[PDB]
Amino acid sequence: IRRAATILAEQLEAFVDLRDVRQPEVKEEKPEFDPILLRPVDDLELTVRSANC
DNA sequence: ACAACCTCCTTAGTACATGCAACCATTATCACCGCCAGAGGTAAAATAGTCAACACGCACGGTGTTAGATATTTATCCCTTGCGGTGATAGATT
């Protein structure tokens, strides 16, 4: 039975021990000079399976 | 001379508002058939070309080997649980 009653048993920690959970936003909107960043992987001199994935 | 009035005459002007569902037929009717148009047909040559031949030449895909990645296994680590000790809350007062 326990998993079949868990959305009623594990609904109790819900009211105490009161630390919680969440995710962010992290990027910027792109792009300008100097062209040190304005380059594809072509500029790196690296292998082919890397260049596929 | 006219006026409107008595009576049933007929005429004909209208009939509230919002919305949804359904599919689009019936006619017969000589169009004759004669002429000839530019105008349908097609042979022979322009506007130009097919695809088979023998060459040409290349791409692609499958079989083979290699690569490395991934999902497993293992084991480690931390973040979490639940209870407990005792916390300065909640809020009444200063």
Residue A34 near residue A41, CB atoms below 8 Å: no
Technique employed here was cryo-EM
Q: How far apart are CA A31 and CA A39, in angstroms?
A: 11
Q: How far apart are CA A46 and CA A53, in angstroms?
A: 12
Give me the resolution in angstroms, 1 decimal. 17.0
Q: How far apart are CA A7 and CA A2, in angstroms?
A: 9
**Interatomic CA–C1' length for residue A37 and nucleotide B63, angstroms:** 43
CA A33 to chain CA centroid, Å, is: 28
**Interatomic CA–C1' length for residue A25 and nucleotide B32, angstroms:** 88
Mapping DSSP onto H, E and C, the string for chain A reads CHHHCHHHHCCCHHHCCCCCCCCCCCCCCCCCCCCCCCCCHHHHCCCHHHHHC
